[PDB]
Amino acid sequence: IGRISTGSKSLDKLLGGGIETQAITEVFGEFGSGKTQLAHTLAVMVQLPPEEGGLNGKAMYIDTEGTFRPERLLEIAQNRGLSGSDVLDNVAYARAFNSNHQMLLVQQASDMMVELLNTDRPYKLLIVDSLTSHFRSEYIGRGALAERQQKLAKHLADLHRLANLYDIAVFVTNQVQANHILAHSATLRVYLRKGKGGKRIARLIDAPHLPEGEAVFSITEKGIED
Ligand SMILES: [Cl-]
Ligand SMILES: [Cl-]
């Protein structure tokens, strides 16, 4: 029973070994709290052998706001003693321009995953960065709200089905600001915040069975570290 290491030993302990397959892990926080950095690191980590904290897997990265950085991936990979070429090849990138496209990409994801399912290097990670931004900007005023929840609930149900069918970890980011409220399902929720300079603090939010707590981690050349 394998898990995906975050690159941080303290964060992994908080998560029971790392982020799980057949589950939706959400990281939520303000802008600059390291949600995208954690997503980039996991996209590299998944490719690693189990002994190095990975699952010899492929990753898919759905980018809704234009935050994906292939150069950052090359940097993380090189700093972890890996081929930069192979890392970029093993991260399937999809730029989502609206909520409809974002939802459709979850079927496209299914198609590419069923094909690699029984192979040596299957998909093991799906990143949605960020899960709710398109739902927040598109459904304007009352009268758009019932449909906004209907669409979001359907999108999360598609992600859950995908995680269970293909034994993949679904890692999602969500910008929750101190000052819109988009209720949705997640297996695990983690609150992220700054942070003593480059230090980030992670807190488990109503995690079932896992003991309550916090983990401190850094944003380095290696992505995420203790
Ligand atoms: Cl393959
Ligand atoms: Cl909603």
What distance in angstroms lies between residue 143's CA and the mean position of ligand 2's atoms?
12
Ligand 1 midpoint to CA 58 (Å): 8
- Is 18 annotated as a binding-site member? no
Experimental technique:
X-ray
- Cα-to-centroid distance, 61 and ligand 1 (Å): 17
Ligand-binding annotation for 36, yes or no, is yes
Strands 214-220 and 58-63: unpaired
| Resolution rounded to one decimal, in angstroms | 2.3
Residue 90 CA, ligand 1 centroid: distance in Å: 9
Question: Would you list the domain boundaries of the chain?
Answer: 1-226
Ligand nearest to the CA of 124: 1
CATH 3.40.50.300 corresponds to the domain 1-226: yes
Pair 14, 5: CB distance under 8 Å: no
Q: 133 to each of 7, 16, 152, 157, 173, how far by Cα in Å?
A: 26, 29, 11, 18, 10
Residues with Cβ–ion distance below 5 A, ligand 1: 116, 119, 121
